[PDB]
């Protein structure tokens, strides 16, 4: 209950890189080239 700090700091304090953090907390989409994208029907719930 001391002065507030951004949460991600602690993640870095556990020896986590930014790429690893984004991998843990987020999903990803990909593209191919021209400029073709692999469509996943479920993801596009609003488009």
């Amino acid at each position: 209950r001391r002065r507030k700090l951004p949460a991600t700091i602690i993640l870095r304090a556990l020896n986590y890189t930014t790429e690893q953090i984004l991998d843990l907390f987020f999903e990803k989409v990909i593209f191919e080239i021209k400029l073709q994208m692999e469509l996943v029907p479920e993801r596009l719930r609003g488009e």
């Binding site: 209950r1 001391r2 002065r3 507030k4």
Partner: protein, 513 residues
């Protein structure tokens, strides 16, 4: 900026949480919180650690530790300093005369031989040699060869080692003599310069070079200048100062410029000693703080312990020599521990307990701990006396020490935040009924004493201080009544007998019991 956002939020809501204030922001945090509550304005809106210990740590930090050789140089510096002042004071004449007079007084059995001197670089033989040199040198003041004789006298005087107390006494005596000379000189300068605008150039030309005769002032009065004419009005005080200076010159037996140069060298040496000692202590502050962390909960606050430790270090650094080779961290810890322990034993409890009694209490506590661990249950006063070698009454007396006074604000009510001090009564107040009884007794005595011949009433009021300013004896009331100490006793006895039987004194019987 950041404070402005928190203030805006607080104004909008009228209240704030600890987390919000802390994020948007130990002693600095408390100070900021206190400032924020100010509004619930302009001064607070516009508005290091404040801990006396953190600032001390900061100010100490800007220091460099000393290695083994790092002390040696400093040490030698100190010696040079002291050596210099010795050579500065070896030339003072009156010092040797005072030493000889004190030695003669000691020889008159007024003090121990050894207390006078801490040896030399045998004591009676060296004193005899010193006396011989003094007698052969004092009677040869004749200028041409006297300087070499005085130099030899001082050189042989150097072989001696003097007690610090009397050496410091001689130094202080020389200092006060120089202070008197300088005060007279300053009075002369103020009465001649400020009062008459006497140029400094004339003072240098005349005062300097001789500084003994009155030609520098008396003969300058006819220089044909306004300051010379104005010096007539203040010529009396300047002449008196000149006479005092001439008298002092006899004592000094030296040129005042030489005295000034000697004092300058002494001051330089003293400053060198001082700077060396400061450099040494600044480094050793770390040792002082390191030692004084084993006495935290003893009644003294950490900083007081640190300051007492600093006194001990300053004493050691003055009593440390590199001949022995003790790494300071071994000759110094002892003084630090001694000082801290004595200070704790002198200013740690409100009702002061002497040092020896503190040691006795600590020893008793240690023995009690050992006994409790060993036997298992507890030691009793008889067993404590047996194990501690005491009459078993001293043990009880030591156990009866008053411990530590209870804070008078200790919340004891537990129902209305009552304090222990609300339940302590005033035991010296006189009950209102006893005051009324005293007044009634006075009235009864006044009533009864009016029922006998005026002479008897006067005698009884004279003997017993009834309404009188003070008591009186038989002979004084006899002087009052022109009789001698016998008829007065008889009349007093008659009156007491008259008041004795009932029907004349019955309410008094009621007062009696």
């Amino acid at each position: 900026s950041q404070l402005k956002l928190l203030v805006t939020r607080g104004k909008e809501q009228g209240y704030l949480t600890y987390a919000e204030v802390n994020d948007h922001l130990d002693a600095d945090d408390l100070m900021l919180a206190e400032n924020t509550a100010d509004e619930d304005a302009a001064e607070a809106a516009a508005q290091r650690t404040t801990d006396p210990v953190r600032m001390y740590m900061r100010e100490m930090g800007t220091v460099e530790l000393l290695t083994r050789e790092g002390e040696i140089d400093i040490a030698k510096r100190i010696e040079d300093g002291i050596n210099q002042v010795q050579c500065s004071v070896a030339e003072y004449p009156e010092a040797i005369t005072y030493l000889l007079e004190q030695y003669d007084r000691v020889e008159a059995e007024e003090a121990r031989l050894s207390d006078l001197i801490t040896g030399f670089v045998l004591a009676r033989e060296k004193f005899a040699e010193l006396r011989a040199q003094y007698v052969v040198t004092r009677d040869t003041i004749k200028h041409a060869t006297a300087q070499e004789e005085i130099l030899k006298l001082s050189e042989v005087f150097k072989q001696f080692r003097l007690v610090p107390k009397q050496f410091d006494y001689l130094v202080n005596s020389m200092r006060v003599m120089m202070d008197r000379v300088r005060t007279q000189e300053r009075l002369i300068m103020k009465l001649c310069v400020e009062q008459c605008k006497m140029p400094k150039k004339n003072f240098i030309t005349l005062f300097t070079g001789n500084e003994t005769s009155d030609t520098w002032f008396n003969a300058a009065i006819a220089m044909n200048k306004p300051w010379s004419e104005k010096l007539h009005d203040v010529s009396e005080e300047v002449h008196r100062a000149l006479q005092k200076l001439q008298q002092i010159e006899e004592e000094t037996g030296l040129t005042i410029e030489q005295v000034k140069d000697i004092n300058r060298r002494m001051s330089i040496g003293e400053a060198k000693a001082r700077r060396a000692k400061k450099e040494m202590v600044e480094a050793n502050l770390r040792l002082v703080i390191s030692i004084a962390k084993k006495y935290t909960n003893r009644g003294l606050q950490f900083l007081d312990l640190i300051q007492e430790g600093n006194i001990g270090l300053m004493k050691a650094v003055d009593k440390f020599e590199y001949r022995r080779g003790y790494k300071f961290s071994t000759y110094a810890t002892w003084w630090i521990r001694q000082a801290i322990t004595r200070s704790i034993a002198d200013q740690a409890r409100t009702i002061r307990i002497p040092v020896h009694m503190i040691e006795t209490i600590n020893k008793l506590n240690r023995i009690s701990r050992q006994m409790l661990q060993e036997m298992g249950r507890e030691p009793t006063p008889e067993e404590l006396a047996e194990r501690m070698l005491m009459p078993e009454d001293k043990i009880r007396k030591v156990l009866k020490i008053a411990k530590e006074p209870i804070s008078m604000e200790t919340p004891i009510g537990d129902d209305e935040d009552s304090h222990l001090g609300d339940f302590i009564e005033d035991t010296t107040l006189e009950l209102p009924l006893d005051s009324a009884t005293t007044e009634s007794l006075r009235a009864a005595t006044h009533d009864v004493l009016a029922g006998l011949t005026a002479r008897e009433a006067k005698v009884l009021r004279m003997r017993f201080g009834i309404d009188m300013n003070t008591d009186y004896t038989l002979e004084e009331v006899g002087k009052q009544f022109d009789v001698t100490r016998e008829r007065i006793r008889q009349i007093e006895a008659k009156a007491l007998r008259k008041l004795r039987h009932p029907s004349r004194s019955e309410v008094l019987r009621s007062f009696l019991d």
